[PDB]
Design a binder for this molecule. Structure first.
Ligand SMILES: N#Cc1ccc(Cn2cncc2CN2CCN(c3cccc(Cl)c3)C(=O)C2)cc1
Ligand SMILES: CC(C)=CCC/C(C)=C/CC/C(C)=C/COP(=O)(O)OP(=O)(O)O
Ligand SMILES: OC[C@H]1O[C@@](CO)(O[C@H]2O[C@H](CO)[C@@H](O)[C@H](O)[C@H]2O)[C@@H](O)[C@@H]1O
Ligand SMILES: [Zn+2]
Lengths: 410, 315
């Protein structure tokens, strides 16, 4: 085969050129933008090939680690736009460090816990910063961050009684949840609620009454899931919808066949990465939102006893996704990104790495099969497809909270 | 009054009319994490916002202050909520507020809070008269803005403004036939008005879509809409469609057409079609072609489809 120092790439095969966009000689804003992206991506792909010499791809761990370590303490005023999403910054950074297997010093862990305590509202839930009203998005982030830390100190910060009351205060009769008091409703709320409620063991029989049905109403003609009933299918909302249903054990409420065909169609034949919706552009964060749907669909179909499921691969091109992330989504200075030309940010660092980990690791039952493209050190720690925190963190947190009673409920 | 960038802007800590209230600094803890090094102007506005919020001061000065807080961070939902509490307490003119939100959304159309605020205003006023035109302007700048389309669906459904939406959809499809948000709106409009059970409507839709496919054979949206409007009844229920696609195959063997044929074969086999073995062989050949040549990015999916077909119909 090949010497260990050269590793052929799917994106560099001569037939790959055939995958470029065919605009049928009818140009529109959509095709023009797609072609511009493909042109740039081809240049990037070509820079990793030296005729028959194709050096192994490398995840720049140390550079990403230094960027993350710095962000966990301080940020420039360029982050004023995320002043109402600080627990997100904690989660994105901690999860990235976790994927990279970089330990969190105890001092830092304690400081994060203290900060998240300051963001917790007396009415329950967490706000975007100290003194802000609670909101399901930063609540989801804060809970995940605390679970990544995983110490009893971190677990105990959560006021479970008030968290459950807070969830009730957002529950709508049609099964949906408001994102916050007097706020908007979309599938993100259902996932945020289901995620924190299951992890902290505060689920009551009525809490999610009607939620599974409302989520199913969000699945549209495309097969994917929109933000609300009637809306266009999007990877972000589809991930939220399916993951929520998996927590509620109600995946069957969806047409899994049309969902499966829709998500697999979102992988870009040329770029290798995923787009968020049909006819839009590739973006590294969808490596998680879209690709993450495959492990969820696998689990769902397996539960139904599907005899045709693979025992070694997810139903997407694992290698191509790794190629897109490694070759096109790394900032030479550390951090990951949407696509070449964009600037790094913690959100893309979190999701590009989360997606890379899913693409590298397949597991179903006792079956485990890894596909780590590039140097062996590229292998990331696994991530749980529902919660997007380490599977070990999920087990440890759920085990801990299962020892506590559901607040005021028997 | 004075905007944050205005030459005469004065920090709140220097305003005589604010001297009676003490600013409330943010409590980040002794050893902060994810600490944003705020500009002096940003912190100044937020120190005073924290003060009025803490005192629950329903005043005109607090109302004007929220406008500055919003310019500094339009994603701060706490500020928006408080602003709405003030709009009601102070009985502010809602049409004036509509003019404000119109300007804000134009500047920052990709934000959840601004669109939600606008929806609340329309609900409060029960006045959707400016909606379709305003949204059309936003879509004129970004034809796929998710929030814009979502708000559009809400207004149309809530105030029953269905009358001219199909024409709007047709105009936007003429501008960019690959705009998936528009094909989604097309489904939204038809399913909610005539429905697709009317065979005349379905035929009109199938013809229209086939026409678009012939014009731009590699536009995935049209292919997805065609399957979307026929999938629930079952693709095998439309025998003429198979023939039409089969004729197009030699001259247009795109992965979309080939995939659509497999979808048809799948349904045929599910419905006790005649010539089972023949259809199954054809379907498996196509899955192989798709996996190995025509749609290799989806080889795992096509191989799975091949195995499913065999687990269900080998007999
Ligand atoms: N929510 C959301 C959202 C909206 C739009 C997108 C579309 N998208 C894709 N790549 C970049 C983006 C734009 N995002 C960055 C993340 N983000 C955000 C802020 C706080 C928390 C979280 Cl999770 C995300 C936003 O609000 C806007 C992605 C995510
Ligand atoms: C838990 C949680 C908060 C999950 C969020 C998931 C998620 C990624 C949602 C996306 C929502 C959205 C409005 C996308 C469109 O933005 P766009 O037009 O900028 O992007 P696009 O062109 O890729 O569609
Ligand atoms: O993907 C289609 C699949 O979704 C469901 C909901 O689970 O219905 C959606 O799609 C229909 C079009 O096929 C729409 O009429 C319906 O409103 C939308 O929720 C399933 O019924 C369908 O098989
Ligand atoms: Zn992105």
């Amino acid at each position: 085969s090949s010497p260990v120092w050269s590793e052929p790439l799917y994106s560099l095969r001569p037939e790959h050129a055939r995958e470029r966009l065919q605009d049928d000689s009818v140009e529109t804003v959509t095709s023009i933008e797609q072609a511009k992206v493909e042109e740039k991506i081809q240049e990037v792909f070509s820079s990793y090939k030296f005729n028959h010499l194709v050096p192994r791809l490398v995840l720049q761990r140390e550079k990403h680690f230094h960027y993350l370590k710095r962000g966990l303490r301080q940020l420039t005023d360029a982050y004023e736009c995320l002043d109402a999403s600080r627990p997100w910054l904690c989660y994105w950074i901690l999860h990235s460090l976790e994927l990279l297997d970089e330990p969190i010093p105890q001092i830092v862990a304690t400081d994060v816990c203290q900060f998240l305590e300051l963001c917790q509202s007396p009415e329950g839930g967490f706000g975007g910063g100290p003194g802000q009203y609670p909101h399901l998005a930063p609540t989801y982030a804060a809970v995940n961050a605390l679970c990544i830390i995983g110490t009893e100190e971190a677990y105990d910060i959560i006021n479970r009684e008030k968290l459950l009351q807070y969830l009730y205060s957002l529950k709508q009769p049609d099964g949906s949840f408001l994102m916050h008091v007097g706020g908007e409703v979309d599938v993100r709320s259902a996932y945020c609620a289901a995620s924190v409620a299951s992890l902290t063991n505060i689920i009551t029989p009525d809490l999610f009454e009607g939620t599974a049905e409302w989520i199913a109403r969000c699945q549209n003609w495309e097969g994917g899931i929109g933000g609300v009933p009637g809306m266009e299918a999007h990877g972000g909302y589809t991930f939220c919808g399916l993951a929520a249903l998996v927590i509620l054990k109600r995946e069957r409420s969806l047409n899994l066949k049309s969902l499966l065909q829709w998500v697999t169609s979102r992988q870009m034949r040329f770029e290798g990465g995923f787009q968020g919706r049909c006819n839009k552009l590739v973006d590294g964060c969808y490596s998680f939102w879209q690709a993450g749907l495959l492990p969820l669909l696998h689990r769902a179909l397996h539960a139904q006893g599907d005899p045709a499921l693979s025992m070694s691969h997810w139903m997407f091109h694992q290698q191509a996704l790794q190629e897109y992330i490694l070759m096109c989504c790394q900032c030479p200075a550390g951090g990951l990104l949407d696509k070449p030309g964009k600037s790094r940010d913690f959100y893309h660092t979190c999701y590009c790495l989360s997606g890379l980990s899913i693409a590298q690791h397949f597991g179903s039952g006792a079956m485990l099969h890894d596909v780590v493209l590039g140097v062996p050190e590229n292998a990331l720690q696994p991530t749980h497809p529902v919660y997007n925190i380490g599977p070990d963190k999920v087990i440890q947190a759920t085990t801990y909270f299962l020892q506590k009673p559901v607040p005021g409920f028997e | 009054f004075v905007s944050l960038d205005s030459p005469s802007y004065v920090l709140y800590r220097d305003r005589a009319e604010w001297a009676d209230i003490d600013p409330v600094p943010q409590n980040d803890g002794p050893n902060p994490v994810v600490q944003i090094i705020y500009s002096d102007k940003f912190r100044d506005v937020y120190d005073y916002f924290r003060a009025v919020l803490q005192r629950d001061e329903r005043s005109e000065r607090a109302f004007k202050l929220t406008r500055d807080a919003i310019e500094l961070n339009a994603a701060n939902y706490t500020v928006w909520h408080f602003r709405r509490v003030l709009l009601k307490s102070l009985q502010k003119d809602l049409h004036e507020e509509m003019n404000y939100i119109t300007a804000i959304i134009e500047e920052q159309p990709k934000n959840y809070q601004v669109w939600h605020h606008r929806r609340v205003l329309v609900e409060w006023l029960r006045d959707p008269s400016q909606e379709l035109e305003f949204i059309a302007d936003i879509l004129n700048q970004d034809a796929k803005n998710y929030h814009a389309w979502q708000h559009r669906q809400w207004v149309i459904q809530e105030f029953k403004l269905w009358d001219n939406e199909l024409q709007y959809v047709d105009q936007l499809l003429k501008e960019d036939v690959r705009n998936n948000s528009v094909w989604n709106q097309r489904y939204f409009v038809i399913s909610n008005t005539t429905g697709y059970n009317d065979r005349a409507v379905l035929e009109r839709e199938v013809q229209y879509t086939l026409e678009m496919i012939k014009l731009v054979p590699h536009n995935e949206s049209a292919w997805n809409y065609l399957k979307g409007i026929l999938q629930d009844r079952g693709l095998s229920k439309y025998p003429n469609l198979l023939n039409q696609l089969l004729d197009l195959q030699p001259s247009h063997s795109s992965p979309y057409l080939i995939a659509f044929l497999v979808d048809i074969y799948e349904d045929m086999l599910e419905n006790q079609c005649d010539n089972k073995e023949d259809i199954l062989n054809k379907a498996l050949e196509l899955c192989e072609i798709l996996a190995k040549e025509k749609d290799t990015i989806r080889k795992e999916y096509w191989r799975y489809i091949g195995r499913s077909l065999q687990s269900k119909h080998s007999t």
